[PDB]
Amino acid sequence: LLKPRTLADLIRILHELFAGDEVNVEEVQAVLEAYESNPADWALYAKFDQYRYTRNLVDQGNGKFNLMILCWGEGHGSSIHDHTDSHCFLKLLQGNLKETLFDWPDKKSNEMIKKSERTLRENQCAYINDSIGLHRVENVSHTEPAVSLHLYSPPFDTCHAFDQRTGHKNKVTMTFHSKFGIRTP
Ligand SMILES: [Fe+3]
């Protein structure tokens, strides 16, 4: 496990770590954390939208994981969501994100209430999966966009969004704003 000097080396070490069947979560998190965000490395993926956060595919991990860059304008956030029985690693490349943790709801319609919340700062790496809980990610800044590096394994095309007032969930199809630096139709 060596310190990645650049995004490209980070991706090379990631392919080595996911070469097997089973993920060593702590080692992935440690190496994502060790990568010191350099904007020159990832400017190509930092494609923003005025109305909501964008998902920008970087690498498909030989089918073992999706590595993608998310671009969060001021005030942009996600729904409360799950991660489709996959691992989710979330590293801050620039700015700050607020993460709010929720428990899976009862089957009785009730307001979802937060377990916790925390700020993720530049270069920190958060980890989550469905056995830990659900979560919402937002850029609450009024002045600074955020950029995060997300790694899901196994990859998934769809997830669930949760309505904070009832806990009822609906299915959501992930959209890509770009793939490999190329904007999608
Ligand atoms: Fe998430």
Please report the DSSP string for 55-84 in residue order.
EEEEE-GGGT-EEEEEEE-TT-BPPEE--T
- C-alpha–C-alpha distance, residues 22 and 62, integer Å: 15
Ligand 1 centroid to Cα of residue 24, in Å, is 19
Burial class (CB in 10 A: 0-12, 13-18, 19+), 142: exposed
Ligand 1 centroid to Cα of residue 81, in Å, is 6
- C-alpha–C-alpha distance, residues 184 and 90, integer Å: 23
Does domain 1-185 fall under CATH 2.60.120.10? My reply is: yes
> DSSP assignment, residue 93?
E
- Which sign does the torsion angle of CA 74, 124, 183, 156 carry? negative
- C-alpha–C-alpha distance, residues 86 and 102, integer Å: 17
Ligand 1 centroid to Cα of residue 153, in Å, is 12
Resolution (A): 2.3
Ligand 1 centroid to Cα of residue 99, in Å, is 9
Check whether 81 is labelled as a binding-site residue.
Answer: yes
Check whether 15 is labelled as a binding-site residue.
Answer: no
Check whether 135 is labelled as a binding-site residue.
Answer: yes
Ligand 1 centroid to Cα of residue 89, in Å, is 8
- C-alpha–C-alpha distance, residues 67 and 57, integer Å: 6
> Residue 160 corresponds to which tokens in the numbers above?
């669930």
Ligand 1 centroid to Cα of residue 2, in Å, is 27
